[PDB]
Scaffold this active site. Structure first.
Site, PDB file in Angstrom:
ATOM      1  N   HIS A   1      52.515  34.405  36.872  1.00 51.24           N
ATOM      2  CA  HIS A   1      52.407  35.810  36.467  1.00 51.24           C
ATOM      3  C   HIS A   1      53.640  36.670  36.742  1.00 51.24           C
ATOM      4  O   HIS A   1      54.034  37.477  35.897  1.00 51.24           O
ATOM      5  CB  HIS A   1      51.180  36.458  37.118  1.00 51.24           C
ATOM      6  CG  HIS A   1      49.885  35.822  36.728  1.00 51.24           C
ATOM      7  ND1 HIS A   1      49.328  34.777  37.432  1.00 51.24           N
ATOM      8  CD2 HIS A   1      49.044  36.073  35.698  1.00 51.24           C
ATOM      9  CE1 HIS A   1      48.195  34.416  36.858  1.00 51.24           C
ATOM     10  NE2 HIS A   1      47.999  35.187  35.805  1.00 51.24           N
TER      11      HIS A   1
ATOM     12  N   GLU B   1      51.535  34.217  44.715  1.00 44.81           N
ATOM     13  CA  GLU B   1      52.717  33.776  43.984  1.00 44.81           C
ATOM     14  C   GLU B   1      54.012  34.100  44.732  1.00 44.81           C
ATOM     15  O   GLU B   1      54.957  33.312  44.699  1.00 44.81           O
ATOM     16  CB  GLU B   1      52.707  34.315  42.552  1.00 44.81           C
ATOM     17  CG  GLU B   1      51.688  33.587  41.685  1.00 44.81           C
ATOM     18  CD  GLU B   1      51.637  34.071  40.251  1.00 44.81           C
ATOM     19  OE1 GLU B   1      52.615  34.683  39.773  1.00 44.81           O
ATOM     20  OE2 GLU B   1      50.606  33.820  39.595  1.00 44.81           O
TER      21      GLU B   1
ATOM     22  N   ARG C   1      31.568  58.525  45.587  1.00 42.60           N
ATOM     23  CA  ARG C   1      31.866  59.655  44.715  1.00 42.60           C
ATOM     24  C   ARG C   1      30.715  59.830  43.732  1.00 42.60           C
ATOM     25  O   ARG C   1      30.283  58.866  43.095  1.00 42.60           O
ATOM     26  CB  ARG C   1      33.177  59.428  43.958  1.00 42.60           C
ATOM     27  CG  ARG C   1      34.427  59.741  44.762  1.00 42.60           C
ATOM     28  CD  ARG C   1      35.719  59.638  43.963  1.00 42.60           C
ATOM     29  NE  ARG C   1      36.824  60.333  44.623  1.00 42.60           N
ATOM     30  CZ  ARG C   1      37.656  59.777  45.499  1.00 42.60           C
ATOM     31  NH1 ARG C   1      37.531  58.499  45.838  1.00 42.60           N
ATOM     32  NH2 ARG C   1      38.625  60.505  46.038  1.00 42.60           N
TER      33      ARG C   1
ATOM     34  N   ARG D   1      38.440  63.817  52.260  1.00 39.79           N
ATOM     35  CA  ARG D   1      37.161  63.928  51.558  1.00 39.79           C
ATOM     36  C   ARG D   1      36.209  64.976  52.138  1.00 39.79           C
ATOM     37  O   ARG D   1      35.243  65.365  51.479  1.00 39.79           O
ATOM     38  CB  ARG D   1      36.479  62.558  51.467  1.00 39.79           C
ATOM     39  CG  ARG D   1      37.193  61.566  50.547  1.00 39.79           C
ATOM     40  CD  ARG D   1      36.963  61.795  49.046  1.00 39.79           C
ATOM     41  NE  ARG D   1      35.543  61.801  48.694  1.00 39.79           N
ATOM     42  CZ  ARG D   1      34.793  60.714  48.544  1.00 39.79           C
ATOM     43  NH1 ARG D   1      35.314  59.503  48.708  1.00 39.79           N
ATOM     44  NH2 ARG D   1      33.511  60.836  48.231  1.00 39.79           N
TER      45      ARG D   1
HETATM   46  O1  LIG Z   1      42.466  29.824  33.843  1.00 39.54           O
HETATM   47  C1  LIG Z   1      42.473  31.033  33.608  1.00 39.54           C
HETATM   48  N1  LIG Z   1      41.656  31.877  34.401  1.00 39.54           N
HETATM   49  C2  LIG Z   1      41.616  33.275  34.150  1.00 39.54           C
HETATM   50  O2  LIG Z   1      40.920  33.980  34.899  1.00 39.54           O
HETATM   51  N2  LIG Z   1      42.410  33.819  33.076  1.00 39.54           N
HETATM   52  C3  LIG Z   1      42.430  35.191  32.758  1.00 39.54           C
HETATM   53  O3  LIG Z   1      43.652  35.935  32.897  1.00 39.54           O
HETATM   54  C4  LIG Z   1      43.916  36.252  34.276  1.00 39.54           C
HETATM   55  C5  LIG Z   1      45.408  36.641  34.376  1.00 39.54           C
HETATM   56  O4  LIG Z   1      46.190  35.578  33.824  1.00 39.54           O
HETATM   57  C6  LIG Z   1      43.223  32.944  32.297  1.00 39.54           C
HETATM   58  C7  LIG Z   1      43.269  31.555  32.548  1.00 39.54           C
HETATM   59  S1  LIG Z   1      44.315  30.550  31.536  1.00 39.54           S
HETATM   60  C8  LIG Z   1      45.813  30.426  32.450  1.00 39.54           C
HETATM   61  C9  LIG Z   1      46.194  29.227  33.152  1.00 39.54           C
HETATM   62  C10 LIG Z   1      47.448  29.169  33.871  1.00 39.54           C
HETATM   63  C11 LIG Z   1      48.311  30.326  33.872  1.00 39.54           C
HETATM   64  C12 LIG Z   1      47.952  31.532  33.179  1.00 39.54           C
HETATM   65  C13 LIG Z   1      46.691  31.576  32.465  1.00 39.54           C
HETATM   66  O1  LIG Z   2      40.339  58.755  47.672  1.00 36.04           O
HETATM   67  C1  LIG Z   2      41.128  57.830  47.473  1.00 36.04           C
HETATM   68  N1  LIG Z   2      40.619  56.509  47.430  1.00 36.04           N
HETATM   69  C2  LIG Z   2      41.495  55.410  47.236  1.00 36.04           C
HETATM   70  O2  LIG Z   2      40.996  54.279  47.131  1.00 36.04           O
HETATM   71  N2  LIG Z   2      42.907  55.654  47.091  1.00 36.04           N
HETATM   72  C3  LIG Z   2      43.846  54.620  46.899  1.00 36.04           C
HETATM   73  O3  LIG Z   2      44.488  54.444  45.625  1.00 36.04           O
HETATM   74  C4  LIG Z   2      43.574  53.910  44.650  1.00 36.04           C
HETATM   75  C5  LIG Z   2      44.100  54.298  43.245  1.00 36.04           C
HETATM   76  O4  LIG Z   2      44.380  55.703  43.222  1.00 36.04           O
HETATM   77  C6  LIG Z   2      43.392  56.993  47.134  1.00 36.04           C
HETATM   78  C7  LIG Z   2      42.522  58.088  47.319  1.00 36.04           C
HETATM   79  S1  LIG Z   2      43.217  59.711  47.340  1.00 36.04           S
HETATM   80  C8  LIG Z   2      42.970  60.282  45.690  1.00 36.04           C
HETATM   81  C9  LIG Z   2      42.010  61.305  45.357  1.00 36.04           C
HETATM   82  C10 LIG Z   2      41.856  61.752  43.988  1.00 36.04           C
HETATM   83  C11 LIG Z   2      42.680  61.157  42.960  1.00 36.04           C
HETATM   84  C12 LIG Z   2      43.644  60.136  43.264  1.00 36.04           C
HETATM   85  C13 LIG Z   2      43.785  59.699  44.642  1.00 36.04           C
END
Ligand SMILES: O=c1[nH]c(=O)n(COCCO)cc1Sc1ccccc1
Ligand SMILES: O=c1[nH]c(=O)n(COCCO)cc1Sc1ccccc1
Ligand SMILES: O=c1[nH]c(=O)n(COCCO)cc1Sc1ccccc1
Ligand SMILES: O=c1[nH]c(=O)n(COCCO)cc1Sc1ccccc1
Ligand SMILES: O=c1[nH]c(=O)n(COCCO)cc1Sc1ccccc1
Ligand SMILES: O=c1[nH]c(=O)n(COCCO)cc1Sc1ccccc1
Ligand SMILES: [K+]
Ligand SMILES: [K+]
Ligand SMILES: [K+]
EC number: 2.4.2.3
Lengths: 250, 251, 250, 250, 253, 251
Positions: free
Chosen positions: E8, E80, E168, E223
């Protein structure tokens, strides 16, 4: 010593196959004194062992300490030394309104609120007492005369939160145990103690006979702080029953 | 007409009966009722067939649960609504211990909960334990009529096949959870497999109802034997004789 | 007999691959009468089997009884004899306000509130109906004309506590199922029945095709007791669809 | 007494907020003797309490007994009396080949193979040691000079099956724990003991500071029988480290 | 000539130039910002949510690689990178505090995480602690002191969702599943500092595979006072946390 | 600027759109949008890339979820807030059945829940089931453009490696729970592994939202591990054509 913790050899037991197992190490001599030729064997950590005689037959008294973990050690090591029958005598807090302080409770099986039982059998396995041991305890209670209740016991790994006590440092109970006492009460559970689930599970799943008896020193629906004289008298009544039950099992 | 949803019975039909013998097989209901005085058919709906009889001048109910916890839970609940407080189960079983023979009688102290219905009454940590008076009565009854009896733990499964680790099936596979499970129960001293006790014992013990469990061994899983019809009927009649004798001690 | 419970041989089926599986043994004769040349094969315990013909092809009707345990026996033993397609017709209690009594519900998949499904696949495995069977049932419902809803069903091992009924002997529901109906309602679950989770799981995990259809005889948001006329009419209504769906799947 | 089990009043502690908590009641005097003005306070069941003085400040030493259940009692009641910092000194069996007998292990967090921890927090909550306590223990081990390993500990409710010992009465281990030691080994788990999961969970979820240190008296990959000379030396080595760490946390 | 040694990330072992440490933010947009704080930053790869930069810290190569939000993509990135030779992982994230005493702009160092995720279970059973490496935690605490910050050290709740798992109710459904109903109050009572979405997976998978992991986050919302974070304060807090994670990496080289 | 916390979109940006196609890869978004009329880029933040297009005069959204349930749950919730009621996932997958070939198209009826995010919406017993109309539309669309299609159950995992029982890893170990799991799923007729469907299907089915799941096979686990860097492109193009044609049937 033949074992890791108890400080006993097979010879120390003199062919004994039955053990009375209190939680309190101080209860050990008290129980042994009720029988013939009492002799101190060992004392290491929470494990105090005495040997005595009952109708010409050698019997062991050995403390488990509080909780399933130390109980599991004591029972395992006694089993290694030749013990096949285990009778627990304990203290308990009743959760049913009809059960009074001073009453005697015989446990048929336990609610498994412990961890150690899982190390011997999965949760679906019943923490059930041996039928012969249960019979002997019920008959012994009727023999010496006592107010006896027979049924299910909740066996908890804690004294406080697992028995839904709020009179604590934190004053909180984890979600899992919130409202749990009321649930057990509605299910007809008689009481709380701390070792039976481990003892009964580990014995029933390993071909060992186990019985459980306890004296009520507190009722949770009316009181929390008991009397320091009724406590000793209740203990003596339960100790009389467990020794009498052992007579029927030899 | 009907005071209950499924059984099709009224409180008056029972005539003050507090005890019920509850077999799994609906055709066994007549067999048990005929052993007692004055057998009368009451109702027959779905898998539930109810017969009323008299034991020592006292009315006794015989009601089929059908196979498994779900219909057992319906039957026991609806009977309790009608006034039944004591339930004695008589069943068939497959033994898993080498020392237990075909024709032997097994009294269950408590059950391994391999069912779903028991969880609807109490969490898994609650023991599927039989009532002490009922268990005593069954043990005494077995000794009374004379039988080879074993007392102990029973594995109560929601399936006949995979949950009892049978591989002689369409798929020929057993889910990971139950793979090697029979050997585990065997090592733990579990006597046998049946399909109703975990539900019955849990729902009764957690609701203030008395329950007992007895079963006749018609097969042993360790020995190479094909179930014989003549021995199957003899074992059934032997177990039926005990459950009725035990009912006499509990009224 | 080649099977342990049903009391049928492979020859008794006459090469049948499809089976309509009702809960009520008294409903087997009703379904078999809708098809050409009905013949009673065997009646043992709760399992009643009838052999009929649909469009010049043999079709089996076999009762499972209430719940997963006997359903698991019936489905497995029919599979041993050669059945590859299973169509369940049942009764149900709706929990959504917009679903009326007399409506027909086709189940895509089931909430597993049973024990038997776990004996075939772990809980994470979906109790999902076969796509072709579901399609056939939806098309059949539209063919004969019915008010149909398609979606998720809660499949319970009990009629009372697992469906949060409080009109019982104890009048209590275990913590796990307390407030459960409201939760399923919010999740868009249509209804309660007692066999689909087991049937759908055991078929989907063993390469067998399964479909699920039910007639609404009770709505939990309004009234608990159904009458006599509407109850029988809904059953006859549902039976017509399951036979019509079987025509498409052969 | 101000508490149910320990036999202590708030006044007995003289303003102490730190306790050293060994499993063995016999170890209490040994730890107290390393500090100034060591005085016995109480002994009830497996709970032996001593008070001493570290750099002019009162410190408590109190045995828990073996296992989470009795630990949970001792820790709760000490918290009620005013203790805010808990330092556990224990014995342990190492499961990694690179850890030798006599080595000192500081636990960052524990695998929860116990029941009592669940009575304070659900399983998903980490049985994690306090950062300041862990730092103090690591620094103390470096101060007196020791071969130290820092990492994860498996905390078991049993000595035998939960630590995958087969040298037992039954000679069997329940399915859940079969092959478990190899799994923990692959996961980099250092060792087995019996109290840390309970202690660390109950403290971390109640705003109490906890640290965990243990002396290796056995390595499970080489030998099972410990020598009764290295055992005393390892204990002494660990006792000196916990006392020095306590100095840093006052 | 060669493009990728992994499935990836689109990186070769040579791209790393002998680096054993990686700073792993959740946001691919943050990768350049972190790299820019070190010497000679260069973009190596960008595939899916995985954006990778390499930079120089005290003459030693350091990798910055985004995990994306959540355990699943984190599990891919960490694995990876480990295949490519990374042995030390430092997560810098954003967080919502649930304790009243923790303010917006504060820095939180995680000792261990409440496992409200699924991916951690794919490496170790639930009973295994999602615990941070002691050296990494020490370095982060020391780095926070070094540059000067209001720091809190403790337990973090690591959730597979932003909404229901963090209780939430301001959502489409307006409902929270039974399991998470009243959960925030429970975590609060247990002294849990905050919510984020990657630490349980990261810490479990590293602690159970002999890899060192540390976790640091900047508080952009509390929060118990507000829900919508200010845009300006968000950038300052992010910058504050980024400076600490680099300074910690310096101590771990 | 934005009505939601992460996506960087206002409800006005959607122009009344109620259907969204949800790929995992943000770089696939433009590819799906280019198949429809008037494609415009709306936002790109984190793993969330959003394009708007027109299908038969009706506005449609294409928005990437990223890999896994957690980011998927953010994308779906925030799209639902903006008015999306129908979700169609197009993904990549590794097949675990010998009869399914590379290039084949898989339509998911329901998913094995090997994820954590689904539990945040419904307990494990709730089925991760696809909407019947969405499933129908996908099956019909696959038959419309012509493809080798298989319909059935998908294992949806929170990891790419251990949860899909890959041993070609840094540690070379798989946790006990997932040891032998692939063989188990294979025996149960599970078609394939992917990483988002359990979360998507559970959260939609339990919140009154319609969801469908389609994936192109780029690897079969019984015959290979590494996908071909050409058949991948062809298969993705194949699946993208089906998801757009299905979307036509659902407007
Ligand atoms: O076996 C797999 N399992 C799986 O959960 N996916 C879905 O895509 C996830 C991110 O590549 C895709 C595949 S096919 C594959 C195999 C080796 C390298 C990249 C994709
Ligand atoms: O409450 C939170 N919960 C949480 O899991 N994160 C971590 O970042 C996750 C993707 O924004 C960050 C926060 S702080 C926040 C509040 C409102 C909008 C975006 C972030
Ligand atoms: O409520 C109880 N729960 C319980 O588990 N036991 C058993 O003995 C455990 C160690 O005291 C005993 C009692 S009775 C009691 C009440 C207050 C102080 C000491 C004992
Ligand atoms: O092995 C058994 N398992 C079991 O659950 N039972 C109880 O009766 C359930 C319905 O037959 C009875 C037996 S004995 C047996 C063996 C082969 C065919 C039928 C009964
Ligand atoms: O609410 C229900 N729940 C349910 O699981 N079913 C399915 O049939 C079970 C045997 O009646 C049927 C109904 S409808 C109903 C209501 C009152 C008496 C009988 C059936
Ligand atoms: O393997 C061990 N497991 C363990 O949980 N402990 C901690 O102390 C428990 C009570 O002895 C100590 C050891 S070391 C050991 C080995 C043989 C006999 C006694 C202790
Ligand atoms: K039945
Ligand atoms: K103890
Ligand atoms: K992601």
């Amino acid at each position: 010593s033949d074992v890791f913790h108890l400080g006993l050899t097979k010879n120390d037991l003199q062919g004994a196959t039955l053990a009375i197992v209190p939680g309190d190490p101080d209860r050990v001599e008290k129980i042994a004194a009720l029988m013939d030729k009492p002799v101190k064997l060992a004392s290491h950590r929470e494990f105090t062992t005495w040997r005595a005689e009952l109708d010409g037959k050698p019997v062991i008294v050995c403390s488990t300490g509080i909780g399933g973990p130390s109980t599991s050690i004591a029972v395992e090591e006694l089993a290694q030394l030749g013990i096949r029958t285990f009778l627990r005598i304990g203290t308990t807090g009743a959760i049913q309104p009809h059960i009074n302080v001073g009453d005697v409770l015989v446990t048929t099986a336990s609610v498994r609120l412990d961890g150690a039982s899982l190390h011997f059998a999965p949760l679906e396995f019943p923490a059930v007492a041996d039928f012969e041991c249960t019979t002997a305890l019920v008959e012994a209670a009727k023999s010496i005369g006592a107010t006896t209740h027979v049924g299910v016991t909740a066996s908890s790994d804690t004294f406080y939160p697992g028995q839904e006590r709020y009179d604590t440092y934190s004053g909180r109970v984890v979600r899992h145990f919130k409202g749990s006492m009321e649930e057990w009460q509605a299910m007809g559970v008689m009481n709380y103690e701390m070792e039976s689930a481990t003892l009964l599970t580990m014995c029933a799943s390993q071909g060992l006979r186990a019985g459980m008896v306890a004296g009520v020193i507190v009722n949770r629906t009316q009181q929390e702080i008991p009397n320091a004289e009724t406590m000793k008298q209740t203990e003596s009544h339960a100790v009389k029953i467990v020794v009498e039950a052992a007579r029927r099992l030899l």
